[PDB]
Amino acid sequence: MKVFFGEHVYGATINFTMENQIHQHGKLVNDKFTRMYFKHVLFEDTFFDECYFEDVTSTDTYFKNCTIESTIFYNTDLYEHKFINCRFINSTFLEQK
Amino acid sequence: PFVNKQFNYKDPVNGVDIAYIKIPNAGQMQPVKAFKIHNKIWVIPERDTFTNPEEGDLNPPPEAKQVPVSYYDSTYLSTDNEKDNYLKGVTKLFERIYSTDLGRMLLTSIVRGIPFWGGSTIDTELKVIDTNCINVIQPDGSYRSEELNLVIIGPSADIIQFECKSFGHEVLNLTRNGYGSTQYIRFSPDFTFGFEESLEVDTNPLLGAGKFATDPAVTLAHQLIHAGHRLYGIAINPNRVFKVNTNAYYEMSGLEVSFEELRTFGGHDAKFIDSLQENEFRLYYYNKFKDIASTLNKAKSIVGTTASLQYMKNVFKEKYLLSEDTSGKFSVDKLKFDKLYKMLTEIYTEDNFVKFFKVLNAKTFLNFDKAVFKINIVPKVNYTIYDGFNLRNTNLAANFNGQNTEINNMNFTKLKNFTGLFEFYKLLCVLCIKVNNWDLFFSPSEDNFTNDLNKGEEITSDTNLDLIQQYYLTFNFDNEPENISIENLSSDIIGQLELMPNIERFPNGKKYELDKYTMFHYLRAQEFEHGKSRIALTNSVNEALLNPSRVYTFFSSDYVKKVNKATEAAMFLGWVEQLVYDFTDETSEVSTTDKIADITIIIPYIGPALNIGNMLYKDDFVGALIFSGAVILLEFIPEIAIPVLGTFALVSYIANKVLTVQTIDNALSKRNEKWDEVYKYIVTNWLAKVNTQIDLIRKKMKEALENQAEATKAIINYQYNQYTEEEKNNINFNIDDLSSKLNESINKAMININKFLNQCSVSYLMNSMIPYGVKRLEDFDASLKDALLKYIYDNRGTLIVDRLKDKVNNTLSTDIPFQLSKYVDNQRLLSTFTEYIKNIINTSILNLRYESNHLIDLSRYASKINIGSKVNFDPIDKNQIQLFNLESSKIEVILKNAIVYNSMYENFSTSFWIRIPKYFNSISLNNEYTIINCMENNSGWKVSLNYGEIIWTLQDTQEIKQRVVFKYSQMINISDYINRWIFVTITNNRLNNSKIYINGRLIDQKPISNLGNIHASNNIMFKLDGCRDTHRYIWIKYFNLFDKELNEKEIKDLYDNQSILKDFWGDYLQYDKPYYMLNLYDPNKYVDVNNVGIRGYMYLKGPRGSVMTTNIYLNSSLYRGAKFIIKKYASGNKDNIVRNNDRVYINVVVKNKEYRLATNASQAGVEKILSALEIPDVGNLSQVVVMCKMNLQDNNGNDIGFIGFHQFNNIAKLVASNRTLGCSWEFIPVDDGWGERPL
Ligand SMILES: *[C@@H]1O[C@H](CO)[C@@H](O[C@@H]2O[C@H](CO)[C@@H](O[C@@H]3O[C@H](CO)[C@@H](O)[C@H](O)[C@@H]3O)[C@H](O)[C@H]2NC(C)=O)[C@H](O)[C@H]1NC(C)=O
Ligand SMILES: *[C@H]1O[C@H](CO)[C@@H](O)[C@H](O)[C@H]1NC(C)=O
């Protein structure tokens, strides 16, 4: 299990699959998750910013205490139940698989 | 089809559909041909010379009947070709009346109405009536008797006399006692009336002359309604006649109009009868149905028929809608009786058929028919099977040109009516003239109207287009009584026609001596014989009447001076252009003096034209009208008197708690009903004795203008004829263009005169009729309040208390608003009334409007209007004000130092429009801030905003705050209260209550009686104050203040008044701008493209999703789907603003490239799947769309269909088809005020 602390991911487009990770106090700014697989990865206290989620398929992933701002969730299965005590800001939720 | 197997004429005599027939008659009648056309309906191709013995000849009688128009012919119907054409036409009219659903229900009602078999002298037996059956003689030699309902026979001696007759009985009055009998309709389809209509210019300003032919379908429908009344035995007594006064010279000499005609005409005419007589008729008919039900219960036997008594009882219980409670005890219920009576009386009317058929007809029976037109109906190229004379896809469809004789002249041929133009006439002398009878005022007598107002009333514990489709849905079918076997009657069926009451011949040639000129002299002074001699215009009637060659005119002296001058060949074109321009000049003149109440357009030259009030000067007429209101127009003042309304007596149940509250509730309800009834009586009196004179004046103006044009072009042609060959050939001229332009000038003047007469009538109603009722009625309120007070204290307390006295003081101190919307239909009248009240009340305290590049007060009270530097104005429309959260984003209004009082605001109101952006910053929660202030030194009012709510605060000197709030949630899928234009108004009665209204709907009331003294602010503040947000901004427009309290009526119409199409936000829709799309029927989905092209299509997918921010807002996404852009196709307006009825093209953006929207209309099915094509498309496909609804039109002008969607299998595709919804759409411009992020 890979523990991640204090990340600053700027302008990164993600295409591959990341699995078995936890992120804490992450600051994902201007990221982009397109056509990828989320497997057993956990987000806690992470502050998103204008990230874009497209055709992302998730399994056992769970967002916790995350501040999600200005994002777009288009063509995804990240339903409401996958978010726990999360605050959205100016965000949106488009058509979902 | 209703009529299958067209029967030609020369088919054999088989015996069930074509056979020889014996009709009942007093004497002997030879076998007569006829053709069964349906169940219980027969059509006889012969002239009616058998039913009535007195009519043995077809020669016109020496004494012509008192009829406006009539034609006579003795060789008609004689030959077999005429018989075939007659029968084809009547069959076509039957199928056409059956085509419409309302007509379908009427035909079913006719079919079901078999007469009752009550002819047995013995009470307990059922016997068929001998006089309501026909003897069908078979080729073998024997005959069989058969019952039926309707017989269609060619006309009587008077050809155009279409009527209904019935065979009476010695002691039983069948037509009015619930029994009913077979009806014989004297009818012909080959002839039509020709009338004149002058109220169509509102829809078709390009209309020429009138002379419209009434659709024969409507006439047959009128005859069928007469029949339908007579089968159910509900005909009104013929001796009940709407009598008129005939003593005066201006009063029409005489004409019979029975109440049955008033009922069958319906609509406007149906209002000529008061509610009391209608109630009497309803009660009488209910009693007669109770009697027939009792007789049916008593009877237990039948003689003369094969089928069971039970079967005939079932048929009759279905016909009369009776109910049997499983015990053989028939009974009628008031609900079903009321439904049937309304269906037969109010639903089946001529007006409703005219509305459904979309054909011309006179709105009132006063518009007497003026010509006889021979027509041909058998060919389909002249009279289409569906839409009548208005054939679709042709030039005749537009503007109802089919019924216009002067266009569709090859279809109608005029005939010479045998009633003389001046056979029935009156004489007027001062120099004597004659007047035709049918061109006089209609003066109803006072006896025809009655009231039960004086009768007192006691209250006990318990006292108390669409509708056509609901009745059709509820209506029953598949139950038509089958043909029945009966024992045959004698060879000859004896019988006498129902006796008609005698009408004495009205006197002719009466002489009246007067000391003044009447308008008939003036109307005659403008006529001429178009002889060879020159005709000269003049300004003196005394010479125009005497000299046949001189014609009176009411125009200016320079005009007559010009028209009397001889001119030469080179000068004539300038002469004709000058005269047409000058004629338009007089016809277009309107007075500018508008200080008079809602007579805004006073037209002067009506005075000298018709000698109204005995002045001959335009200025004198204007002064007289200004001084005397609308009274001077009326020839005779209609007397109105409202006697004292009866008191109200309440019963008392000693020691009661909930029944007494019911007593007060019923008292209030009966108060409201009494107010409604008295308004209805006042309206019907006004319509009976005021509107007819105004209509006659309008007709006289129309014919006067036409006569003036006639004289002008007559003298012009006289001058034209003077030339030699070279002048007339070198200098061309035609009369058609002159006639067209003069007629267009007549129409533009006639619009003004029609509107003027409309405000005249409405103003007279509002001024000199309603106060008389309202004074007695408020006295009734005073007495009723006294009674309720005596009961509310009764010096005792064993009762059930401040709430009751509050309610009684509230409602019995105010007045119910008066509207004709609930009394009249005439759309023209409707508009004038409401438009008036709102337009006049506009003038108020502050009318802050931005025009002429400045924000000014049109109410000329505001002292100064300060404008801050940081305010903003909308370039597309300068009347919008945008206010920012900065100090200089301020507007100050210096209120008039006159209207500022310490204890003012006793009754007053405010109204304006606000658009609010969507709250973003969380600090704005519970952050109240004032947006509009009129509060000084802890006293005044303020409008404030907070998180999703509007607050109106009233505040007195002694700290008593009163806050009324209107709230709305931000977490909703679709909102009508965010970023949208919202009408907000506040009404205040410092005596009773403060009320809030939003866009014209009731929200909240709070008491303000505890408020004391509320000192008036010196000025008005427009500024954000205390708003912690650094980006908050507002939009407001059309702010208005009212010095008196308003009412629901004046506020609702105001909304529409202040309301060019709008977008989602309510702002003006604009050209060459992108817009998203939204259908109101399906809000949760958006639009999407697929494989664009001819094969490509638009469809509905989703869900649109959701954008939200925690504990601030949640809402579905709005910027979904491809954006739509609109650009001009043929609109000539320079600006990019769209208006109503604008034909434009529609394009859509797909991956940042533009596509036309178009479809192929030749595809099968009414649904027309639209498609997205490239800009280089083919012009054959329909792409022009008219404008919240949009309609696609073919390149030839045919409407492809309303743009909407259809559920094509599992795909919600888009269509242009010809549903209560699906025609509603909405455009979403990109708005910075909403803030959702696109991508
Ligand atoms: C959520 O979105 C809203 C609107 O989409 C954001 O509010 C907006 O914030 C911007 C940036 O400050 C404001 O722009 C301003 O423009 C003026 C004129 O150019 C400029 O002088 C200012 O310095 C500022 O840049 C914009 O007015 C403002 N809109 C509203 C309606 O307030 C908001 O910040 C986003 N985030 C949150 C948490 O709400
Ligand atoms: C995702 O994009 C990267 C960068 O262009 C590319 O190297 C990679 O092959 C893509 N992902 C997959 C799994 O193909």
Quickly list DSSP for B871-921.
-EE-SS-TT-EEEESSTTS-EEEE--SSS--TT--SEEEEEEEEE-PPP--
Q: What is the DSSP letter of B332?
A: -
Closest residue to atom 18 of ligand 1, CA basis? B1031
3-state secondary structure of B834: helix
Closest residue to atom 6 of ligand 2, CA basis? A15
* Rounded Cα distance, B868 and B497, in Å: 88
- Whether residue B260 contacts residue B269, with contact meaning beta carbons closer than 8 Å, is answered with no
- Whether residue B649 contacts residue B457, with contact meaning beta carbons closer than 8 Å, is answered with yes
- Whether residue B1144 contacts residue B1159, with contact meaning beta carbons closer than 8 Å, is answered with no
Other beta carbons within 10 angstroms of residue B75's beta carbon come to 8
Q: What is the DSSP letter of B1156?
A: E
Ligand 1 touching residue B1029 (CB < 6 A): no
* Rounded Cα distance, B294 and B123, in Å: 11
Residue A39 in domain: yes
* Rounded Cα distance, B1032 and B1024, in Å: 8
Cα B861 from chain centroid (whole Å): 40
Ligand 2 touching residue A36 (CB < 6 A): no
Burial class (CB in 10 A: 0-12, 13-18, 19+), B712: buried
* Rounded Cα distance, B429 and B807, in Å: 64
* Rounded Cα distance, B861 and B635, in Å: 42
* Rounded Cα distance, B1203 and B402, in Å: 29
Q: Separation of A17 CA from ligand 2 center, angstroms?
A: 11
Q: Separation of A72 CA from ligand 2 center, angstroms?
A: 21
Burial class (CB in 10 A: 0-12, 13-18, 19+), B679: buried
From the candidate CATH numbers 2.60.120.200, 3.40.50.300, 3.40.47.10, 3.40.50.720, the one assigned to the domain spanning B843-1058? 2.60.120.200
Q: Separation of A16 CA from ligand 2 center, angstroms?
A: 7
Say which residues have a Cβ less than 8 Å from residue B677's Cβ, sequence separation at least 6.
B275
State the CATH number of the domain containing residue A8: 2.160.20.80
Identify the CATH class of B522-628+691-768. mainly alpha
Residue A18 in domain: yes
Q: Separation of A75 CA from ligand 2 center, angstroms?
A: 19
A92 at B interface, C-beta within 8 A: yes
Among A78, A84, A93, most B C-beta atoms within 10 A, so best to mutate, is A93
**Omega within 30 of 0 (cis) for the link into B205:** no
Q: What is the DSSP letter of B632?
A: T
Residue with tokens 């009674």: B787
- Whether residue B77 contacts residue B154, with contact meaning beta carbons closer than 8 Å, is answered with yes
Q: Separation of B1230 CA from ligand 2 center, angstroms?
A: 36
Pocket probe for ligand 2: among A13, A16, A19, A54, the residue whose CB has the most ligand atoms within 8 Å is: A16
Residue with tokens 């909930």: B658
φ/ψ of B787, rounded to 5, equals: -65, -45
A72 at B interface, C-beta within 8 A: yes
Contact A93 B1105 (CB under 8 A): yes
Closest residue to atom 8 of ligand 2, CA basis? A15
CA neighbor of B78 nearest in space, from B47, B118, B38: B47
Q: Which long-range contacts (CB under 8 A, 24 or more apart) does B648-653 make?
A: B648/B456, B648/B457, B648/B458, B648/B459, B648/B783, B648/B784, B648/B787, B649/B456, B649/B457, B649/B458, B649/B459, B650/B458, B650/B459, B650/B787, B650/B791, B651/B458, B651/B459, B651/B460, B651/B461, B652/B791, B653/B461
Chain B positions contacting chain A at CB under 8 Å are: 920, 1101-1103, 1105-1110, 1117, 1235-1237, 1239
* Rounded Cα distance, B790 and B854, in Å: 59
Torsion of CA B1216, B1221, B1223, B1225, to 10 degrees: -130
* Rounded Cα distance, B1237 and A93, in Å: 12
- Whether residue B646 contacts residue B416, with contact meaning beta carbons closer than 8 Å, is answered with no
CA neighbor of B113 nearest in space, from B57, B197, B175, B201: B175
DSSP per position, B358-423: T----SSTTS---EEEE---SSTTTSBTTTBTS-TTSTTTGGGGGGBTTTSTTT-EEE--SS-TTS
CA neighbor of B964 nearest in space, from B905, B911, B1005, B1012: B1005
* Rounded Cα distance, B290 and B976, in Å: 54
Task: State which residues form the domain around A19.
Answer: 2-88
Q: Which two tokens stand for residue B980?
A: 């949208």
Ligand 2 touching residue A85 (CB < 6 A): no
Say which residues have a Cβ less than 8 Å from residue B398's Cβ, sequence separation at least 6.
none
Contact B1105 A87 (CB under 8 A): no
Identity at A48, one-letter amino acid code: F
**Method used to determine the 3D structure:** cryo-EM
Residue A94 in domain: no
3-state secondary structure B1106-1150: EEEECCCEEECCCCCCCCEEEEECCCCCCCCECCCCCEEEEEEEE
CA neighbor of A70 nearest in space, from A93, A54, A86: A93
Residue A96 in domain: no
- Buried/exposed code over B901-933 (b: 16+ C-beta within 10 A; e: otherwise): eeeebebbbbbbbbbbbbbbeeebeebebbbbb
- E-state strands within B885-1018: 891-894, 907-915, 929-935, 940-946, 949-955, 961-967, 982-989, 993-998, 1001-1007
* Rounded Cα distance, B498 and B496, in Å: 6
Burial class (CB in 10 A: 0-12, 13-18, 19+), B305: middle
* Rounded Cα distance, B157 and B62, in Å: 13
Q: What is the DSSP letter of B120?
A: -
**Residues B82, B84, B85, B86: is their CA dihedral positive or negative?**
positive
Chain B residues touching residue A91 (CB < 8 angstroms): 1107-1109
Burial class (CB in 10 A: 0-12, 13-18, 19+), B412: buried
Ligand 1 atom nearest the C-alpha of B920 is 39
- Name the residue among A88, A89, A95 with its Cβ closest to that of B1105: A95
- Whether residue B841 contacts residue B908, with contact meaning beta carbons closer than 8 Å, is answered with no
Q: Which two tokens stand for residue B577?
A: 């252009």
> CATH 2.60.120.200 residue ranges in chain B?
843-1058
* Rounded Cα distance, B1178 and B1176, in Å: 7
Residue with tokens 């817009």: B1075
- Name the residue among B1101, B1102, B1105 with its Cβ closest to that of A92: B1105
Q: What is the DSSP letter of B431?
A: -
* Rounded Cα distance, B274 and B270, in Å: 9
- Whether residue B1129 contacts residue B1135, with contact meaning beta carbons closer than 8 Å, is answered with no
- The residues with which B1086 forms a beta bridge, in sequence order, are B1101
Chains A, B: CB contacts under 8 A, how many? Answer: 34
Distance from CA of B1105 to the nearest CA of A (A): 4
Residue with tokens 């209560």: B1220
Identify the CATH class of B18-130+140-415. alpha beta
Contact A95 B1107 (CB under 8 A): no
Among B918, B1101, B1108, B1113, most A C-beta atoms within 10 A, so best to mutate, is B1108
3-state secondary structure B1162-1222: CCCCCCCECEEEECCCCCCCECEEECCCCEEECCCCCEEEEEEEEEECCEEEEEEECCCCC
Contact B1108 A72 (CB under 8 A): no
* Rounded Cα distance, B923 and B1103, in Å: 32
Ligand nearest to the CA of A16: 2
- Whether residue B291 contacts residue B298, with contact meaning beta carbons closer than 8 Å, is answered with no
Residue A35 in domain: yes
Residue with tokens 């004896």: B494
Residue B875, CA atoms < 13 Å, CB-side half-sphere:
3
Residue with tokens 């009015």: B176
Ligand 1 touching residue B1093 (CB < 6 A): no
- Name the residue among A70, A72, A87 with its Cβ closest to that of B1110: A87
Ligand 2 touching residue A5 (CB < 6 A): no
Q: Which two tokens stand for residue B162?
A: 């279409």
Q: Which two tokens stand for residue B79?
A: 């030959």
Contact A92 B1117 (CB under 8 A): yes
* Rounded Cα distance, B542 and B1202, in Å: 61
A80 at B interface, C-beta within 8 A: no
Residue of A nearest to B1109 (CA): A89
Tell which A residues from 8 to 67 touch B, by Cβ distance under 8 Å.
none
- The residues with which B50 forms a beta bridge, in sequence order, are none
* Rounded Cα distance, B1149 and B160, in Å: 64
Say which residues have a Cβ less than 8 Å from residue B1217's Cβ, sequence separation at least 6.
B1166, B1167, B1168, B1201, B1202, B1204, B1206
* Rounded Cα distance, B902 and B895, in Å: 14
- Whether residue B67 contacts residue B156, with contact meaning beta carbons closer than 8 Å, is answered with no
- The residues with which B849 forms a beta bridge, in sequence order, are B856
> CATH 2.80.10.50 residue ranges in chain B?
1074-1228
| Angle made by CA atoms B1167, B1168, B1174, in degrees to the nearest 5 | 160
Identity at B646, one-letter amino acid code: G
CA neighbor of B523 nearest in space, from B488, B502, B552, B492: B552
CA neighbor of B174 nearest in space, from B239, B117, B125: B117
Say which residues have a Cβ less than 8 Å from residue B525's Cβ, sequence separation at least 6.
B541, B544, B545, B551, B552
* Rounded Cα distance, B885 and B870, in Å: 9
User: Across the beta sheet with A27-29, what order do the strands follow?
Assistant: A8-10, A27-29, A47-49, A67-69, A87-89
CA neighbor of B953 nearest in space, from B999, B986, B927, B982: B986
Ligand 1 touching residue B920 (CB < 6 A): yes
Closest residue to atom 7 of ligand 2, CA basis? A15
* Rounded Cα distance, B524 and B337, in Å: 54
φ/ψ of B1127, rounded to 5, equals: -140, 160
Contact B1102 A95 (CB under 8 A): yes
Longest dimension (CA), chain A: 33
CATH topology of domain B1074-1228: Trefoil (Acidic Fibroblast Growth Factor, subunit A) (2.80.10)
Residue A49 in domain: yes
Burial class (CB in 10 A: 0-12, 13-18, 19+), B422: exposed
Ligand 2 atom nearest the C-alpha of A15 is 1
**Taking each helix axis from N to C terminus, what angle separates B802-811 and B770-793, rounded to the nearest 10 degrees?**
170
* Rounded Cα distance, B883 and B1021, in Å: 12
CA neighbor of B535 nearest in space, from B527, B558, B556: B527
Other beta carbons within 10 angstroms of residue B1217's beta carbon come to 19
- Whether residue B564 contacts residue B716, with contact meaning beta carbons closer than 8 Å, is answered with no
Ligand nearest to the CA of B1109: 1
- Name the residue among A87, A88, A94 with its Cβ closest to that of B1105: A94
How many structural domains does chain A have? Answer: 1
Q: Is B310 left (phi over 0), alpha (psi -120 to 50) or beta?
A: alpha
Q: What is the DSSP letter of B570?
A: G
* Rounded Cα distance, B789 and B806, in Å: 11
Q: Which two tokens stand for residue B471?
A: 């009745």
CA neighbor of B422 nearest in space, from B435, B439, B441: B435
Q: Which two tokens stand for residue B498?
A: 């129902």
φ/ψ of B1133, rounded to 5, equals: -65, 130
Residue A97 in domain: no
Residue A95 in domain: no
CA neighbor of B874 nearest in space, from B1036, B1030, B1061: B1036
CA neighbor of B1143 nearest in space, from B1181, B1194, B1204: B1194
* Rounded Cα distance, B555 and B606, in Å: 11
**Taking each helix axis from N to C terminus, what angle separates B736-768 and B691-721, rounded to the nearest 10 degrees?**
160
3-state secondary structure of B440: coil
**Residues B607, B609, B614, B616: is their CA dihedral positive or negative?**
positive
